[PDB]
Design a protein around this ligand. Structure first.
Ligand SMILES: *[C@@H]1O[C@H](CO)[C@@H](O[C@@H]2O[C@H](CO)[C@@H](O[C@@H]3O[C@H](CO)[C@@H](O)[C@H](O)[C@@H]3O)[C@H](O)[C@H]2NC(C)=O)[C@H](O)[C@H]1NC(C)=O
Ligand SMILES: *[C@@H]1O[C@H](CO)[C@@H](O[C@@H]2O[C@H](CO)[C@@H](O[C@@H]3O[C@H](CO)[C@@H](O)[C@H](O)[C@@H]3O)[C@H](O)[C@H]2NC(C)=O)[C@H](O)[C@H]1NC(C)=O
Ligand SMILES: *[C@@H]1O[C@H](CO)[C@@H](O[C@@H]2O[C@H](CO)[C@@H](O[C@@H]3O[C@H](CO)[C@@H](O)[C@H](O)[C@@H]3O)[C@H](O)[C@H]2NC(C)=O)[C@H](O)[C@H]1NC(C)=O
Ligand SMILES: [Ca+2]
Ligand SMILES: [Cu+]
Ligand SMILES: [Zn+2]
Length: 1222
């Protein structure tokens, strides 16, 4: 079936803590009937959310909006397909008027939408019972979301709604959103809610006791702002990975399930210690719906105070500011040795003998292992001037030993302080529900700490690692905030030249204490020692203040993450992950953090390894070039990689057609696994730079990587498997390369590029591409020019709000739909590469308008919105099923509105029509030349022209002929003939091509061919119709044929094959009897004998006796009718006349009326009045009448007015298909 939904934007009033400060919003809401009188019974626990739209596969959601509010809206879906008349975004998709009705519904309003849920829109084999999608009104997106325009779009797989078994309980939908009721359609507080409720006020979330439960998470909120959801009683399931936090991002779709198993009420809340999220919590009741041996670890631990040297033996002699603020004592500087309290491991309840400490574990307590089924036995004894505690994260059973019942008036063991000298015996037990689930690494990483004051307890050093594994090398990123540590005063009075030197809230004072630590140490002090070929695990944490997300990275290294290989790992605050690197690369490396404002403050450490058939070849150089992003004006000097040729970096290897989407991006540098990459890098530009790909697998024997200007480096390495994809992956995978002298200061410059590593026999012949599938590359960032190496020099053109457009939002460098190259086939796989790089603004949420896609990590998950944390280079695949112009956005307004978008062209590859050069529909004044030479005018250069003279020709040796389709078009193919004079064969044999979109900016042509330009091959005689195809098609309006080699005289007769932009040119099958004779009827059919001019015979080019429609009469009314029997979109009428028995008969002037249901008609008005269509001056030449308002309808009629001799019609409708309402 299809299931029709009724809607309405309906501006309503909202105050959060209810079903007292009231706020004004607008809110989708179902209505019962097309009358739009009654509303729909909506359950209490929804709140704002637009109704839950449940669609199967092969279904046809219809919808029917009604903007009852005081502003335009839309109905942009995500994750389903729609006929362009049902998108919902105004951008120059070069589409009609009837197809931008959907873009913005006005007040009063209406419009019906229709949605498709294709087999491609459905969910994969390892995808849930139902995908999680939304929809949002999409006029202004910032204002649309903050006002409460968002719904739940569910795409349940084929056959799945027969009320599955006993559906009874099942699922609820959570909209962890951040309505900023300030910057909305009515302009205040950034109101963190959950379905529209703040502060534990969300009524209805009810589970079953043993039955599980299914959450359809939806992120929302129009500006980065990370989030982090816990259900405190519980752990979450996504894919089949055990997760604690639903680490939701800007705009995000998840499908988590959790298994309630303990009765009660649990605080579905939002952690993130960055103070805020006022609210972002709500309650989750769970009542009871009706009808190889486990070992036992022992640990004697205690919490004893101590002196802590943050950076110890480090030479750290700097007194020239910055680094020194942290490590050197002075006038109002505690310095670097602060007093702290940590955990400490002993041997027995005597608590008199510590156990052997170790570097590579600074400040973090002992390692607590824990297999599933195993039991831990934590015996804890405080030893400090304060009451501390020890609770674990992840393990859920945690009652004290011996007895279950909790002690004094305490409700939970978390907040039961341990008085400074007593001994508590804890018993932790691990059940499978706390451990890994096949799809995650054998050990998951977890922490444990004190819970009498979650913050300051940990800011003193009360932290330690705990693993939960199935049936060493701990790294902890910790921002210890001394100014919250208890022992601060006990440190001032001991380390300051006057304990009266209070100051306190001095920014420089406080900021000189946020020590930025790895494990325990700072500033390249945590030097760890691992030999070669050791195959190591790395349990990696991020606990502390932090409140950002860290982008951790080993240097020249690569860890198997979630089954798949990666380079940068994103840890959210209070999250741990396990990564598996096979350390097969020598040298000394750094264990950094990317986020600049960190590694520049200490957070670094060193790795120090060492011990105890083809050859792909690239020539890239770093050229200083000038930019402007969107001129189609301030211009900025940037620097990019550029692919060259000779070792003498002379020829710059121009790119075209295929590589016109990089612009900023350096050149694709591809490789098959187990051959050799060699990049010969030369430095043009000012300042030195480099080329580091993290893959550069060196050879044994700090490893400089400096490239002073005019100098050249050779990187050469064998591309291994811990680089290549992985059976379950894709036929290729993307890494990245840039310069590693300043990691990011020389990237806002522009040095960036994609590096592919394809499977073992997929990189094809001498093309060195894959040709099977169109690969691309979208690099989303947010270029900050004020940070460049050239912000001085870029004074070729007082920091308040003058930044604004010193910060460009750049898909590949082109702000605001300024990105070209995105020209794609129709039905044809495409392998997009998705990156993001920079600061933590960059959690970009990329959305392929109208389009879904899929991605692979040891399984195949169908997605439709992929969030790009910086460092993560993905790789997706999609086949576009509809031809038009679409968008790649960034669904967070303030980041999209500021200009982060581009379009891509999908063209129907069965659309290939003669532009009109032969038929003449290309008029003479469109065809220009370069010295007509003489009488062989260029206005002749048409195919098949016959008349002794009949071509363009020129003695001149360097010439050219150009056209102009009047419009930008898909120039898809050119033919080529020649002429003959006397006994001479006039032909061209070797010609190139130029094209442009204004007439004064020509580009050559480079498709596939391995040269500076494609060199075509003309004819060999006076009739060799040579059909050259541009299989990398041409988008242009002005094409220009340049000959290079010629017999006798360069002389040509051509004809251009192409289609319009939105692929609407091919005939609707009049001539090829694809429209049954019965589908055509007319007012009158002249007939007697040797006749029957039946209206059935109106087909263009039709031959034979009695071969046109002819009314019995011949009056200026009359008509011919064409019931398409399906709503097509008509974009032109080709019309023609016949000659019968020395009586040429045609039709001079006709006009078109279009019905819809067969009896209600409307004449094609033009500029108010009616349009008299010209055409047909003789009795054979067809004449095409394009329509500037491309008429719709399934019915069509031709009325002939002024004719000639008699009325003889022959036609062929020029159109294409669609589907308008229902
Ligand atoms: C939701 O829960 C939050 C969490 O407590 C509530 O926050 C409290 O909100 C009130 C007003 O909405 C704040 O009052 C104001 O406090 C400031 C700072 O002291 C003071 O200068 C003002 O004159 C006013 O008294 C209150 O401080 C704040 N609690 C905090 C910040 O801890 C909130 O009220 C709840 N409801 C909503 C709708 O947010
Ligand atoms: C080594 O690098 C230096 C960098 O200054 C090169 O010197 C410069 O070379 C360029 C080559 O075209 C000369 O042309 C001019 O460049 C300036 C930019 O500096 C540009 O704005 C102009 O339009 C012009 O094309 C430039 O005069 C020259 N500058 C100096 C001070 O010598 C040098 O060529 C490199 N080494 C070799 C062997 O080429
Ligand atoms: C120059 O352009 C591309 C290089 O990017 C060449 O790739 C060809 O692209 C087409 C469609 O985009 C591919 O067609 C498909 O091929 C498979 C394999 O048989 C077939 O099963 C599909 O049904 C479809 O026909 C084509 O394979 C691919 N490669 C080749 C060698 O044709 C394109 O061919 C080049 N064009 C010219 C004129 O040289
Ligand atoms: Ca549209
Ligand atoms: Cu964004
Ligand atoms: Zn939150």
């Amino acid at each position: 079936a299809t299931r029709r939904y009724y809607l309405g934007a309906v501006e309503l009033s909202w105050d959060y803590m209810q079903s007292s400060v009231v706020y004004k919003k607008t809110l989708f809401v179902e209505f019962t009937d097309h009358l739009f009188n009654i509303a729909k019974p909506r359950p209490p626990w929804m709140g704002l959310l637009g109704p839950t739209i449940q669609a199967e596969v092969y279904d046809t959601v219809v919808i029917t909006l009604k903007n009852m509010a005081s502003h335009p809206v839309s109905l942009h879906a995500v994750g389903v397909s729609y006929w362009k008349a049902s998108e919902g975004a105004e951008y120059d998709d070069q589409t009609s008027q009837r197809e931008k009705e959907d873009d913005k519904v006005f007040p009063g309003g209406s419009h019906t939408y229709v949605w498709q849920v294709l087999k491609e829109n459905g969910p994969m084999a390892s995808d849930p019972l139902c995908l999680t999608y939304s929809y949002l009104s999409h006029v202004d997106l910032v204002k649309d979301l903050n006002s409460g325009l968002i719904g739940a779009l569910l795409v349940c797989r084929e056959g799945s709604l027969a009320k599955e078994k006993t559906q009874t309980l099942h699922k609820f939908i959570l909209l962890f959103a951040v309505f900023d009721e300030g910057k909305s359609w009515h302009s205040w507080p950034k109101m963190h809610t959950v379905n529209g409720y703040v502060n534990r006020s969300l009524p209805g979330l009810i589970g079953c006791h043993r039955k599980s439960v299914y959450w359809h998470v939806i992120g929302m909120g129009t500006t980065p702002e990370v989030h982090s959801i816990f259900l405190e009683g519980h752990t979450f399931l996504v894919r089949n990975h055990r997760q604690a936090s639903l680490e939701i991002s800007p705009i995000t779709f998840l499908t988590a399930q959790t298994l309630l198993m303990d009765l009660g009420q649990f605080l579905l809340f939002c952690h993130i210690s960055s103070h805020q999220h006022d609210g972002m919590e709500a309650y989750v009741k769970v009542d009871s719906c009706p009808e190889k041996h486990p070992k036992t670890w022992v640990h004697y631990i205690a919490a004893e105070e101590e002196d802590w040297d943050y950076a110890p033996l480090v030479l750290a002699p700097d007194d020239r500011s910055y680094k020194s603020q942290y490590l050197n004592n002075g006038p109002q500087r505690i310095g670097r040795k602060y007093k702290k309290v940590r955990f400490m491991a002993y041997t027995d309840e005597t608590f008199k003998t510590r156990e052997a400490i170790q570097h590579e574990s600074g400040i973090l307590g002992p390692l607590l292992y824990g297999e599933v089924g195993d039991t831990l036995l934590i015996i804890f004894k405080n030893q400090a001037s304060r009451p501390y505690n020890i609770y674990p994260h992840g393990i859920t059973d945690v009652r004290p030993l011996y007895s279950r019942r909790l002690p004094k008036g305490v409700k939970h063991l978390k907040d039961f302080p341990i008085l400074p000298g007593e001994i508590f015996k804890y018993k932790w037990t691990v059940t499978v529900e706390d451990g890994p689930t096949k799809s995650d690494p054998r050990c998951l990483t977890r922490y444990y700490s004190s819970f009498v004051n979650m913050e300051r307890d940990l800011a003193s050093g009360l932290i330690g690692p705990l693993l939960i594994c199935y049936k060493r090398n701990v790294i902890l990123f910790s921002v210890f905030d001394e100014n919250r540590s208890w022992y601060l005063t006990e440190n001032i009075q001991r380390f300051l030249p006057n304990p009266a030197g209070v100051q306190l809230e001095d920014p420089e004072f406080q900021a000189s204490n946020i020590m930025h630590s790895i494990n325990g140490y700072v500033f390249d002090s945590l030097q760890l020692s691992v030999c070669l070929h050791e195959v190591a695990y790395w349990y990696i944490l991020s606990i502390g203040a932090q409140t950002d997300f860290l982008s951790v990275f080993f240097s020249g290294y690569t860890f198997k993450h979630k089954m798949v290989y990666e380079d940068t790992l994103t840890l959210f605050p209070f999250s741990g992950e396990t990564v598996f690197m096979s350390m097969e690369n020598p040298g000394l490396w750094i264990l950094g953090c990317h986020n600049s404002d960190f590694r520049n403050r200490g957070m670094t450490a060193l790795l120090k390894v060492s011990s105890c058939k083809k050859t792909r070849h690239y020539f890239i150089a770093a050229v200083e070039r000038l930019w402007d992003y969107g001129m189609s004006v301030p211009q900025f000097k940037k620097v990019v990689f550029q692919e060259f040729t000779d070792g003498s970096f002379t020829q710059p290897l121009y790119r075209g057609e295929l590589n016109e989407h990089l612009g900023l991006l350096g050149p694709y540098i591809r490789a098959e696994v187990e051959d050799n990459i060699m990049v010969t890098f030369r430095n043009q530009a000012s300042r030195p730079y480099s080329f580091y790909s993290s893959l550069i697998s060196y050879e044994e024997d700090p490893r400089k990587n400096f490239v002073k200007p005019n100098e050249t480096k050779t990187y050469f390495w064998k591309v291994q498997h811990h680089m290549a994809p992985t059976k379950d992956e894709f036929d290729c995978k993307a890494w990245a390369y840039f310069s590693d002298v300043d990691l990011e200061k020389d990237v806002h410059s522009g040095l960036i590029g994609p590096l592919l590593v394809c499977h073992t026999n997929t990189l094809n012949p001498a093309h060195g591409r894959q040709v099977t599938v169109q690969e691309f590359a979208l690099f989303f960032t947010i270029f900050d020019e004020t940070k460049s190496w050239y912000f001085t020099e870029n004074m070729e053109r007082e920091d308040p709000t003058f930044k604004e457009n010193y910060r460009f939002h750049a898909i590949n460098g082109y702000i605001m739909d300024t990105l070209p190259g995105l020209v794609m086939a129709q039905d044809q796989r495409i392998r997009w590469y998705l990156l993001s790089m920079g600061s933590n603004e960059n959690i970009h949420s990329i959305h392929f308008s109208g389009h879904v896609f899929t991605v692979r990590k040891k399984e195949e998950y169908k997605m439709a919105l992929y969030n790009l944390y910086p460092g993560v280079f993905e790789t997706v695949e999609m086949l576009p099923s509809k031809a038009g112009i679409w968008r790649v956005e960034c669904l967070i307004g303030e980041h999209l509105h500021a200009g982060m978008s581009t379009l891509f062209l999908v063209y129907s590859n069965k659309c290939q029509t003669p532009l009109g050069m032969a038929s003449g529909h290309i008029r003479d004044f469109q065809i220009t030349a370069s010295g007509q030479y003489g009488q062989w005018a260029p206005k002749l250069a048409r195919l098949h022209y016959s008349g002794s003279i009949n071509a363009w020709s020129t003695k001149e040796p360097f010439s050219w002929i150009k056209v102009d389709l009047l419009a930008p078009m898909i120039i898809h193919g050119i033919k080529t003939q020649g002429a003959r004079q006397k006994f001479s064969s006039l032909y061209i044999s070797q010609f190139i091509i130029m094209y442009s979109l204004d007439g004064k900016k020509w580009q050559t042509y480079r498709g596939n061919s391995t040269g500076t330009l494609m060199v075509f091959f003309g004819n060999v005689d006076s009739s060799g119709i040579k059909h050259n195809i541009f299989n990398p098609p041409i988008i242009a309006r002005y094409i220009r044929l340049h000959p290079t080699h010629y017999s006798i005289r360069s002389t040509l007769r051509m004809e251009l094959m192409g289609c319009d932009l939105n692929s609407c040119s091919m005939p609707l099958g009049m001539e090829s009897k694809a429209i049954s004779d019965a589908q055509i009827t007319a007012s009158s059919y002249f007939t007697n004998m040797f006749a029957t001019w039946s209206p059935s015979k109106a087909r263009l080019h039709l031959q034979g006796r009695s071969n046109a429609w002819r009314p019995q009469v011949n009056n200026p009314k009359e008509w011919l009718q064409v019931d398409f029997q399906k709503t097509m979109k008509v974009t032109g009428v080709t019309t023609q006349g016949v000659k019968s028995l020395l009586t040429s008969m045609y039709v001079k002037e006709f006009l078109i009326s279009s019905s819809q249901d067969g009896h209600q008609w409307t004449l094609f008005f033009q500029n108010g009045k009616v349009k008299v269509f010209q055409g047909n001056q003789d009795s054979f030449t067809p004449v095409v009448n394009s329509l500037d308002p491309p008429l719709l309808t399934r019915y069509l009629r031709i009325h002939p007015q002024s004719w000639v001799h008699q009325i003889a019609l022959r036609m062929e409708v020029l159109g294409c298909e669609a589907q308008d309402l229902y």
